[PDB]
Design an enzyme around this catalytic site. Structure first.
Site, PDB file in Angstrom:
ATOM      1  N   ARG A   1      -2.095  13.171   4.431  1.00 44.67           N
ATOM      2  CA  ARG A   1      -3.001  12.112   4.928  1.00 44.67           C
ATOM      3  C   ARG A   1      -3.174  12.184   6.439  1.00 44.67           C
ATOM      4  NH1 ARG A   1       2.427  10.664   4.615  1.00 44.67           N
ATOM      5  NH2 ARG A   1       3.113   9.426   6.407  1.00 44.67           N
TER       6      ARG A   1
ATOM      7  N   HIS B   1       0.849  -1.227   0.000  1.00 40.65           N
ATOM      8  CA  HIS B   1       0.000   0.000   0.000  1.00 40.65           C
ATOM      9  C   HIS B   1       0.867   1.254   0.000  1.00 40.65           C
ATOM     10  CE1 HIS B   1      -3.620   2.226   1.781  1.00 40.65           C
ATOM     11  NE2 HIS B   1      -2.658   2.969   2.305  1.00 40.65           N
TER      12      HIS B   1
ATOM     13  N   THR C   1     -18.180   9.442  -0.231  1.00 42.49           N
ATOM     14  CA  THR C   1     -16.883  10.046  -0.429  1.00 42.49           C
ATOM     15  C   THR C   1     -17.112  11.556  -0.370  1.00 42.49           C
ATOM     16  OG1 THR C   1     -16.003   8.260  -1.867  1.00 42.49           O
ATOM     17  CG2 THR C   1     -14.947  10.433  -2.060  1.00 42.49           C
TER      18      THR C   1
ATOM     19  N   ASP D   1     -18.974   3.814  15.157  1.00 45.12           N
ATOM     20  CA  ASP D   1     -19.890   4.021  14.059  1.00 45.12           C
ATOM     21  C   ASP D   1     -19.761   2.759  13.197  1.00 45.12           C
ATOM     22  OD1 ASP D   1     -17.444   4.341  12.573  1.00 45.12           O
ATOM     23  OD2 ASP D   1     -17.492   6.509  13.142  1.00 45.12           O
TER      24      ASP D   1
HETATM   25  C1  HEM Z   1       0.173   9.605   0.436  1.00 43.64           C
HETATM   26  C2  HEM Z   1      -0.767   8.659   0.477  1.00 43.64           C
HETATM   27  C3  HEM Z   1      -0.780   7.488   1.505  1.00 43.64           C
HETATM   28  C4  HEM Z   1       0.191   7.001   2.296  1.00 43.64           C
HETATM   29  C5  HEM Z   1       1.654   7.464   2.417  1.00 43.64           C
HETATM   30  C6  HEM Z   1      -0.362   5.907   3.066  1.00 43.64           C
HETATM   31  C7  HEM Z   1       0.317   5.178   4.008  1.00 43.64           C
HETATM   32  C8  HEM Z   1      -0.299   4.363   4.915  1.00 43.64           C
HETATM   33  C9  HEM Z   1       0.364   3.639   5.975  1.00 43.64           C
HETATM   34  C10 HEM Z   1       1.881   3.696   6.309  1.00 43.64           C
HETATM   35  C11 HEM Z   1      -0.556   2.934   6.619  1.00 43.64           C
HETATM   36  C12 HEM Z   1      -0.284   2.020   7.827  1.00 43.64           C
HETATM   37  C13 HEM Z   1      -0.492   2.717   9.157  1.00 43.64           C
HETATM   38  C14 HEM Z   1      -0.098   1.820  10.318  1.00 43.64           C
HETATM   39  O1  HEM Z   1       1.040   1.243  10.289  1.00 43.64           O
HETATM   40  O2  HEM Z   1      -0.924   1.675  11.268  1.00 43.64           O
HETATM   41  C15 HEM Z   1      -1.828   3.183   5.983  1.00 43.64           C
HETATM   42  C16 HEM Z   1      -3.013   2.650   6.391  1.00 43.64           C
HETATM   43  C17 HEM Z   1      -4.217   2.784   5.771  1.00 43.64           C
HETATM   44  N1  HEM Z   1      -4.469   3.501   4.609  1.00 43.64           N
HETATM   45 FE1  HEM Z   1      -3.043   4.651   3.647  1.00 43.64          FE
HETATM   46  N2  HEM Z   1      -1.684   5.733   2.737  1.00 43.64           N
HETATM   47  C18 HEM Z   1      -1.963   6.703   1.773  1.00 43.64           C
HETATM   48  C19 HEM Z   1      -3.156   6.879   1.139  1.00 43.64           C
HETATM   49  C20 HEM Z   1      -4.308   6.167   1.385  1.00 43.64           C
HETATM   50  C21 HEM Z   1      -5.545   6.307   0.640  1.00 43.64           C
HETATM   51  C22 HEM Z   1      -5.747   7.242  -0.571  1.00 43.64           C
HETATM   52  C23 HEM Z   1      -6.445   5.494   1.204  1.00 43.64           C
HETATM   53  C24 HEM Z   1      -7.901   5.230   0.803  1.00 43.64           C
HETATM   54  C25 HEM Z   1      -8.737   6.180   0.419  1.00 43.64           C
HETATM   55  C26 HEM Z   1      -5.801   4.824   2.314  1.00 43.64           C
HETATM   56  C27 HEM Z   1      -6.404   3.906   3.151  1.00 43.64           C
HETATM   57  C28 HEM Z   1      -5.816   3.351   4.266  1.00 43.64           C
HETATM   58  C29 HEM Z   1      -6.486   2.516   5.228  1.00 43.64           C
HETATM   59  C30 HEM Z   1      -7.983   2.108   5.227  1.00 43.64           C
HETATM   60  C31 HEM Z   1      -5.417   2.153   6.227  1.00 43.64           C
HETATM   61  C32 HEM Z   1      -5.569   1.292   7.489  1.00 43.64           C
HETATM   62  C33 HEM Z   1      -5.380  -0.171   7.116  1.00 43.64           C
HETATM   63  C34 HEM Z   1      -5.091  -0.927   8.388  1.00 43.64           C
HETATM   64  O3  HEM Z   1      -4.202  -0.481   9.154  1.00 43.64           O
HETATM   65  O4  HEM Z   1      -5.727  -1.979   8.616  1.00 43.64           O
HETATM   66  N3  HEM Z   1      -4.497   5.246   2.385  1.00 43.64           N
HETATM   67  N4  HEM Z   1      -1.647   4.063   4.935  1.00 43.64           N
HETATM   68  C1  LIG Z   2      -3.248   6.030   4.940  1.00 44.57           C
HETATM   69  N1  LIG Z   2      -3.693   6.956   5.456  1.00 44.57           N
END
Ligand code: HEM
Ligand SMILES: [C-]#N
Ligand code: HEM
Ligand code: HEM
Ligand code: HEM
Ligand code: HEM
Ligand SMILES: [C-]#N
Ligand SMILES: [C-]#N
Ligand SMILES: [C-]#N
Ligand SMILES: [C-]#N
Lengths: 239, 239, 239, 238, 239
Positions: free
Chosen positions: D173, D160, D221, D182
């Protein structure tokens, strides 16, 4: 006349199903102002005659959240638009909320030419003489698997459909409209009958056939009403 | 206008589809009140003629629970926002319920370079000389499986899409908007045609192709209207 | 009356379930005009007592967004339509909001003849004496897989259904209506009981049987009310 | 309230409250609506010691929605009291709520297991930018996601992040953990000046395995523009 | 009161969850008239204190589209019906719209006797001394596959559920209601806590267990509020 029968039987004709329910604040309006607003609708439907065919159905007390349905046939959907918009602008129309609007085009049959000759002959029958029958409208959306089948396969499945429906040809009148691209369904099905238990048994018979497993959506809404002259329906709101 | 055509054709341009339905209590108002209200909208659209392109569509009597649609093109969605906000703050605007708001960006094609040269040439045709066409808008969301496919496989599937659509290139004009992240859908598809039956036949042709089956969501709503001068729509509310 | 009992027990009789919500502005009215509004509804029911049976249920405080239900039995749905239409036009009826509307027909049982003799004997029991029971109405739609099964296979599955239900024969009265084609569901199930926990235990018992996995839709809404004389309910609305 | 602290510390509740204005609001005299707008601004100022309230114009960008607040608080009780007072104002009383979602900020679960280069890159988070576009995407994971071991979810979350790397500069973000408060598991929040970059980012993530574990994505959204409260409210005082 | 405690702990007691949202037109009423209306609700509750327990929760600003919830315990749902109907008829009640109405019964546990002995002992702790906690209500519907499992298999799955929840026995109070057949869900779960992050962690721990994959529906709505004396809730609407 034959102009009416033409619109009802010829291919390339658009059928539109428009459903309406009367709001409450309608009955807050003074009585005689409502008998008068009903006259407007009477004349408007008379004016659009020829150009389009408007048939009226009392859904009140048979379909939830619905009082009136129009079935409209027109060579150009543009004309149906214009009538409905003028209808909705009448004083009676302003107090209506829409409960559905669906369109489809009549087409020459796709599968019938591949059926046995005896079946083609039986399909010549389509309902009987019936004054003020019940009418049922059922929108249908097919699953993606239906469209992936080839024509030979779909032909066999539709033969099975037709075979099951054969006993009901005299007591249930049918008309199929091809709707894909004009709204969210593929088909609009329309039926008239004097005997609702026959229609019920017909649908039950069709439920067993393979093609009734390819219906991703069936109904929603299933509309049930009685076919009547428009003045009798609007008469109810002037009381 | 070359400016108008640049917005309708260039990449990086935002397309917004804003649907409205008129309140019931708009009609409880006196005719003269409603009269002044329509003139202010025309002026607003002219005030924005410099920044954005606004085209109007009559949905009333063709799409359920929808009277009016704007298709707006702009280089900045901030501009579209400001227009629509200002619009919804007009005397007319103050009485509209929103029935849909979708955005997408035009992009240069992703798959076309991989099609055969003959197909690339055929694609130069895009619709017909058409005044007051029907317009159809279909929002689409792809399934997860689509995005899991690699580029080569999606290319093959989009060539099949294109092949099935080729016979409709002359009578159905198309414009594709990339929507993902701006609302709940991946694409907004837009079509103009004088011949609704041709459009219906086009969608039927595409239902058969393997790319169809990757649509997690298709329509909901499928918007059907007539493209018209604003005055023609506005006039109906002035009656 | 034997005729009442005929309507409630004979085959080929239509059962209609009509639900309504009373408007906030009903209670604005002086108890005087409501007392007479109530007498108007009484009058109408009595007037129709030669053709149809009307029974009433208080849903207020037990079913979300519903105050009143009628269960109407008629030999013709057009009789029910005319009654409900007239009822909705009464002064009280004008202050109700239509909610759900479902119809089905009573049928001689399809499967019971194939059950063990002891089960056929046990099925002679259906409810017991009790004044003002609770009532529950659950609409059900079967999946396509159900209809593709043959009669033998469905008989075996319905035997299992009945086996799970046997401990509830006396405490829960049952009536089944065949609904397909008259609205969006295949059956309307109707129950009376004095002991809601027994009903709850019945449904739980049924959840384990294979037939209960063939329910494409179950409830939505599950209507829960108290059965009582129309006068009592209506005078609760008069105060 | 220390604003940077609320926006960055763990254990802070974020609430997204969406509102649409009743039509009868426009039948009020302009003077009444001017006064009402001052009441709202003053209320926010009175609460500025306890919570952070940021305002977004959804009108014209999100269907059926005019205004969003993003509220940060140490306790949801404070958020409740603020929103309830807001909904009781002259203006608030004409608003219909079109959404209410809450979640807590948490120290990252997966990042410790990513490569050191990724950990470093993640230090970058967006963009000095006035009045950005904001997007809010509620997400619910499927049951299969939670059945996976932590090692497997770590690898999927590295994939991801790998796909998101190019966009670290242009898209800010903030992730909120929502389960139990919720009907969703996560509230995602983004700021950008370049909507096409955000679009391209979501497209890049649609290809990754994790994005096939979303039982629900959006609905709604929310797309808005971040703005001083006074500028949003002045529209309603016309 | 021992009787309060009997209602909250004994098997066979009905719990009802009634959610309300205040209409905007309430706020047009003069402040004085709303002050008198609050008073009336207070006395209605006192009047019913002999037969039922009514607890109140402020949902306003924590649950979307919801201001107030009652949790009502009664030995007969008939009593709850009469209270809620009288409440909806008060002037304050006439300006509320319902956002939910669910019922369930308390039962002796189904699976606990099959757990290890030490687990049975642990289940003796339920919650804390905590004034004005947060409350959460989550309606749940199981899938058909759950009900197809035998009792031994469901016992093992519920043991795993309980194992995951053990750390939270002091910090989150729980009460389970068996709802099947009374509305469209199988269970109503109810929780009180002073620390929402602990509740969040509890649900996260449970998402990992096999049983949580059998939830056909979970929430919709998830109700979050603060438990408080009714006067304080009602005060806000008096302002
Ligand atoms: C610059 C853009 C983004 C970066 C750098 C990024 C990075 C990350 C990282 C590092 C995590 C893990 C957090 C942790 O370790 O607890 C995460 C989780 C998550 N991200 Fe992103 N993300 C980005 C964009 C997005 C987008 C556009 C979406 C959806 C619209 C998204 C949805 C999610 C969700 C639902 C999680 C939680 C998943 C989980 O921990 O079970 N992310 N993101
Ligand atoms: C990923 N926020
Ligand atoms: C007397 C009763 C009926 C007869 C004789 C009948 C006969 C037929 C025939 C011959 C076709 C093929 C048309 C063609 O070749 O293009 C057809 C199509 C269709 N029928 Fe019926 N039908 C009956 C009742 C029903 C009912 C009760 C329904 C559903 C409520 C239904 C739903 C449909 C649908 C959706 C199609 C289109 C399927 C397709 O072309 O892909 N029919 N019917
Ligand atoms: C004459 C009619 C049509 C033609 C010539 C046509 C052609 C195309 C072509 C060439 C593309 C690829 C664009 C690219 O490379 O980026 C495309 C994409 C697409 N088309 Fe069509 N199309 C037609 C009608 C339709 C219709 C009726 C629909 C659906 C209602 C539709 C839905 C789509 C969608 C959703 C995509 C995007 C798929 C993706 O890029 O993943 N098209 N179309
Ligand atoms: C003491 C309680 C009950 C008994 C004795 C009972 C028994 C039966 C029997 C014998 C039939 C078959 C009728 C026939 O042969 O045509 C039947 C059909 C049916 N029952 Fe029940 N039932 C009870 C409660 C329920 C409940 C609580 C439900 C659902 C909420 C239910 C749902 C249905 C449905 C949907 C059918 C029609 C299935 C079909 O014919 O395809 N029953 N029931
Ligand atoms: C301290 C926290 C919890 C504990 C100690 C706990 C414990 C239990 C136990 C022992 C049972 C079995 C009852 C019986 O034998 O009949 C049960 C059932 C159940 N629990 Fe929990 N639970 C907790 C939290 C939760 C949460 C947070 C949820 C959902 C949000 C939940 C949902 C359910 C449901 C739906 C059942 C009924 C399952 C069935 O009987 O089919 N529980 N719980
Ligand atoms: C099929 N008609
Ligand atoms: C493709 N449009
Ligand atoms: C079963 N009735
Ligand atoms: C679990 N209650």
């Amino acid at each position: 006349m034959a102009d009416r029968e033409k619109l009802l039987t010829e291919s390339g004709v658009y059928g539109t199903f428009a459903t309406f329910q009367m709001d409450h604040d309608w009955w807050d309006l003074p009585g005689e102002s409502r008998v008068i607003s009903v006259a407007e609708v009477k004349g408007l439907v008379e004016q659009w005659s020829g150009k389009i065919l408007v048939e009226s159905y009392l859904l009140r007390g048979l379909s939830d959240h619905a009082d009136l349905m129009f079935r409209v046939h027109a060579r150009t959907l543009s004309d149906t638009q214009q009538f409905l918009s003028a209808f909705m602008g009448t004083r009676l129309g302003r107090h209506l909320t829409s409960g559905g609007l669906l369109h489809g085009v009549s087409k020459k049959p796709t599968y019938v030419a591949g059926f046995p000759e005896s079946m083609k002959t039986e399909l010549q029958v389509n309902g009987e003489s019936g004054s003020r029958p019940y009418a049922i409208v059922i929108p249908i959306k097919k699953d993606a698997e239906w469209w992936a089948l080839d024509q030979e396969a779909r032909t066999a499945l539709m033969q099975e459909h037709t075979q099951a429906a054969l006993p009901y040809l005299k007591t249930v009148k049918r008309k199929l409209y091809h709707s894909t691209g004009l709204d969210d369904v593929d088909f609009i099905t329309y039926f008239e009958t004097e005997r609702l238990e026959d229609f019920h048994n017909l649908v039950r018979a069709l439920q067993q056939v393979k093609e009734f497993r390819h219906n991703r959506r069936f109904g929603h809404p299933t509309l049930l009403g009685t076919m009547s002259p428009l003045d009798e329906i609007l008469e109810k709101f002037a009381q």
